[PDB]
Structures are given as C-alpha cells and as structure tokens.
C-alpha cells in the first residue's frame, strides 16, 4: 500500500516541477501507472486478508474502492482539461494537487485498520472537495453548496468521534481485527441506542438518506465536473464502507434500530426516482438517481446478510462508474451550450451518433440491465429484502419502473427528436471525451465478465 501512496505523493512534485506544456501528460500517464500497480492487492489466493502493517490492511471490500479511486484520477484529470485550460498554470496545478490529495486520502481511508485514522481522513476529504466546488464552480450557489456539504458531514461526524473515543476508553484499541474477535453483546439500553445513532448518522448523511440529502444535488449541480465524479463515485461509498466496518460492534441493536432507516431509504428512493422523472436539470437528475440507488445500499447494509452486503458492494462500484459516466456525458454538452437545462438541446444523435451510444450504455447500466453488475447488485439486495419481508418487492418494482422511465426519458428528450437547428456551436467531438466514456464503460464490461472480484466480505 505504501508502494501505492508514496508514488501518489510523488505525483505532486511531478506537477509543480514540470513544464506548463508537459504537466497534464506526465501526471496523467503516471496516474494510470499508479492504477496499474494498484492491482497487486488483488492477489488474494487465500481466505486470510492482507495486512501490511499496523496502519494498513486490505480486504475484498477495501480493494475495489482502492482500485476505483486510483483509476478515477486520470479520468477526472482529462475531463478537467477543457475548462481551466485558459486558467493560469498555478491554478491548474492547484487543481491537480487537490485531486491527488483526494486520491491519497481516500486510499488511506479504505486501507485503514483503526477507526480514528479513517475518521481524520474521511474528514480531511472535505477540504479538497470544498476548494474544488468553490474556486472552480461556475455559478454563485456554489458557496451555499459548500456550506451544506461541509456542515451536514460535520454535524454527523462529531458524534462519531465521541462514539469512537468511548469505544477506545472501553476496549482499548479501536482496531478492526480486534473489534471483530472481541465484541460483547450490547445490553439494549438508550445509552447504547444513542451510540448506534452516533456511529451511524455520520455515514448515513454521506450516503445519503432521504431525510438528509439536500447537500448532494446542490453540490453535484455546482461542482465543475471532477468534484461531481468523486462525489458520485466514492464519497458516497465512503459511508457504506464505514457502516459495513462499524456495524459489527453494534449487534443486536441493528435488529430494531434499523426499521426507520430501511423505511426512509425505501420510500425516499421511490420519492427521489419520481423526482428524477420530472426535473429540469440534468446534473440534478443524475444526483437524485444516485440517492435512489444508495438508499438500497442503506437498506442492504441494515439487513446485514451475505447476499445483501454482496449486492451492496456490486451496486457501489457499478453506480460509481456509471454515475461518473453520466456526469461526463452531461458535461460534454454543458461545455458547449453552457446550460444544465436538458430540454434546451434535445435532438442530438445527428451530430454525436457515437456519444449517443455511450449515453445509451450508461443508461442501460443505470436501469436494471441483467448482464451487468448493476442488476446483480439490485437483484441480490431485492432477494435479501424479500427474505427480510416479502412486501418490499412492491416498492422495489415501482422503483424499477420509474428507473426505466426517467433514464429512457433522459435519453429521448436529450438525443432523440428534431435537432435544435439554432445551435451552430455543436462542435463534432473530442477524442479526449470519447476516451473518457470508453474508460468508464470498458471496466463495466470486464467486471461483468468476472464479478468474483467485485463481491465483498461474504463471498
């Protein structure tokens, strides 16, 4: 792991000491190589997980998030290359440094053994995101968005610190291997239900729940792009990972402190997908879809079954890839029209007949297409929920219907129709922004060809 996060640190001098004309290239290529060397930790020939030190470990839940975080960086970096091309070189390099800092801190999170390491890094991730959203957003609502996105997190996370501190004072170590093998059943009192809530309602904010999600549209809609990629791809999964790690020390309270959150997730998933059915803003449509997806992950982690954790991991990775892809696809048009309004430009597939295939595949990923790690996750958590209660499929099916609807409606009212003939500024395409979608989709196909990796702790 050290061999993954030291080169990631060396990517920063590589930015600052290189020419202005040979800085995107070098850092992009070397980031791809970091992604390559982040495959050694998929060499798990055994059941025992990979401990490299007291600091760092890597389980089959860590490794996909690690690899995806190392893999997104070149994509963020190339997507961020048309805008801030007319920016001063120092400003460019500051953007690069923030993205690399995100990479490093997120790898450290997913590789951490203790919960306090994970805490300080889970919170250090806020500073790059806030800077990216605020200094490089295009609109004026970015400031309120940053405030929301920061303070929801901090409100949720201060109780988390208090609970971790309590657990240290009670057990002594706060390490995840030892909390696994030494976990006392809880006495089922209010003093422990508050502990459950303090441990959970930091991650549940970040995933997010439907009661608390207003930070995610305001941020996705206003972050330039790369912030949106990350905020859709791994910052939401940074809560699911934490829940999967911390739930082991909360049994048996999860059997009854989970009803409200499963229920909120399910109903609010339906609510969010219905919103996606009727939404003027494309970058908000993607965001509400992300809420409607992560709600299933919430319910799944609450059920704590093998099928459920499995499907949660699958849906995590799949949603991350396809959501980053859809944000790229919307940015591709926003870099020309400079409008997020979707019904503005609605008759493409004449000018962009190849991007319109990436659109289609991105949507089919989004809706439940079977030979895909999206439907595998959605199906397995549907099966877990049916085992839990047979009356949940009534809601999952409504979601499936609406999720076909808003995705196909997006495709239709953006591509299909009559071309907006008043748009002379529809430049043909960028090889860069075609390679982007290819690099988002080719992993989906590969992982569908081999989902033995993309499962989690339980398979």
Partner 1 sequence: GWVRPDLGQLSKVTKVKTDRPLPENPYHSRARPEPNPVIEGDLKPAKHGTRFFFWTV
Ligand X SMILES: CCCCCCCCCCCCCCCCCC(=O)OC[C@H](COP(=O)([O-])OCC(O)COP(=O)([O-])OC[C@@H](COC(=O)CCCCCCCCCCCCCCCCC)OC(=O)CCCCCCCCCCCCCCCCC)OC(=O)CCCCCCCCCCCCCCCCC
Q: Residue 58 belongs to what H/E stretch?
A: strand 57-58
CA angle 365, 316, 434 (to 5 degrees): 45
> Distance between terminal CA atoms of the chain?
23
Structure tokens at 378: 């959605």
Which residues, numbered 356-375, are part of the site for ligand X (CB under 6 A)?
357, 371
The minimum distance between CB 356 and ligand X, in angstroms, equals 7
x/- site string to ligand X, residues 119 to 148, per CB under 6 A? -x----------------------------
The minimum distance between CB 445 and ligand X, in angstroms, equals 6
Between 24 and 118, CB nearer to ligand X:
118
If one asks whether residue 172 binds ligand X (CB under 6 A), the answer comes out as no
Give contact residues for partner 1 (rule: CB under 8 A): 53-55, 113-114, 116-117, 168, 174-175
Pairing of strands 57-58, 50-51: antiparallel
Which phi and psi (to 5°) does residue 244 adopt? -65, -30
If one asks whether residue 3 binds ligand X (CB under 6 A), the answer comes out as no
Judged by beta carbon distances under 5 to 8 A according to partner kind, the member of ligand X, partner 1, none in contact with residue 116 is partner 1
Between 174 and 376, CB nearer to partner 1:
174
Which residue in the set 354, 401, 412, 446 belongs to the binding site for ligand X (CB under 6 A)?
354
Structure tokens at 17: 């000491």
If one asks whether residue 10 binds ligand X (CB under 6 A), the answer comes out as no
Between 116 and 351, CB nearer to partner 1:
116
**Interacting span for ligand X (CB under 6 A) from 30-38, 209-217, 285-293, 351-359:** 351-359
Structure tokens at 132: 């990216």
Between 115 and 250, CB nearer to partner 1:
115
Q: How far apart are CA 392 and CA 255, in angstroms?
A: 17
Q: How many residues interact with ligand X (rule CB under 6 A)?
A: 7
Q: How far apart are CA 274 and CA 409, in angstroms?
A: 12
Classify residue 252 by its DSSP letter.
T
Q: Are the C-beta atoms of residues 211 and 158 closer than 8 Å to each other?
A: no
The minimum distance between CB 120 and ligand X, in angstroms, equals 6
Structure tokens at 450: 């081999």
Q: How far apart are CA 100 and CA 74, in angstroms?
A: 10
Q: Could you list the residues that contact ligand X (CB under 6 A)? A: 55, 120, 353-354, 357, 371, 445
């Amino acid at each position: 792991m050290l061999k993954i996060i030291l080169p990631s640190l060396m990517l920063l001098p590589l930015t600052w000491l290189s020419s202005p004309k040979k800085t995107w290239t070098n850092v992009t290529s070397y980031s791809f190589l970091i992604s390559l060397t982040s495959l050694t930790l998929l060499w798990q020939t055994d059941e025992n997980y990979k401990n490299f030190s007291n600091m760092f470990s890597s389980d089959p839940l860590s490794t996909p998030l690690i690899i995806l975080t190392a893999w997104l960086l070149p994509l963020m970096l190339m997507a961020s290359q048309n805008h801030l091309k007319k920016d001063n070189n120092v400003l460019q390099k500051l953007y690069i440094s923030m993205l690399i800092s995100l990479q490093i801190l997120l790898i450290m999170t997913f590789s951490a053994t203790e919960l306090i390491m994970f805490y300080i890094l889970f919170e250090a991730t806020l500073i790059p995101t806030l800077i990216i959203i605020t200094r490089w957003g295009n609109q004026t609502e970015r400031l309120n968005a940053g405030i929301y996105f920061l303070f929801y997190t901090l409100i949720g996370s201060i109780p988390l610190l208090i609970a971790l501190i309590l657990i240290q004072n009670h057990v002594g170590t706060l390490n995840l291997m030892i909390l696994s093998f030494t976990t006392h059943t809880l006495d089922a009192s209010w003093s422990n239900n508050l502990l459950w809530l303090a441990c959970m309602m930091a991650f549940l904010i970040k995933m997010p729940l439907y009661g608390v999600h207003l930070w995610l549209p305001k941020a996705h809609v206003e972050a330039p792009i790369a912030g949106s990629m990350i905020l859709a791809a791994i910052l939401l999964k940074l809560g699911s990972y934490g829940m999967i790690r911390i739930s082991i020390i909360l049994d048996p309270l999860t059997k009854y402190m989970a009803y409200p959150f499963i229920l909120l997730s399910l109903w609010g998933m339906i609510m969010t997908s219905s919103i996606c059915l009727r939404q003027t803003d494309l970058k908000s449509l993607i965001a509400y879809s992300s809420v409607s997806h992560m709600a299933l992950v919430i319910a799944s982690i609450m059920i704590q079954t093998p099928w459920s954790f499995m499907g949660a991991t699958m849906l995590m990775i799949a949603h991350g890839l396809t959501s980053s892809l859809l944000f790229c696809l919307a940015n591709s048009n926003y870099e020309r029209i400079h409008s997020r309004t979707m019904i503005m430009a609605r008759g493409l597939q004449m000018v962009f007949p190849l991007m319109a295939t990436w659109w289609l595949m991105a949507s089919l990923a989004n809706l439940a297409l079977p030979p895909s790690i999206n439907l595998m996750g959605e199906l397995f958590i549907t099966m877990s929920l049916f085992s839990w209660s047979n009356f949940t499929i009534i809601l999952m099916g409504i979601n499936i219907i609406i999720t076909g609807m808003y995705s196909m409606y997006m495709i239709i009212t953006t591509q299909r129709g009559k071309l907006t003939n008043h748009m002379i500024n529809l430049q043909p395409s960028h090889t860069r922004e075609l390679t982007l979608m290819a690099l988002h989709m080719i992993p989906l196909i590969l992982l569908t060809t081999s989902p033995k990796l993309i499962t989690g702790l339980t398979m």
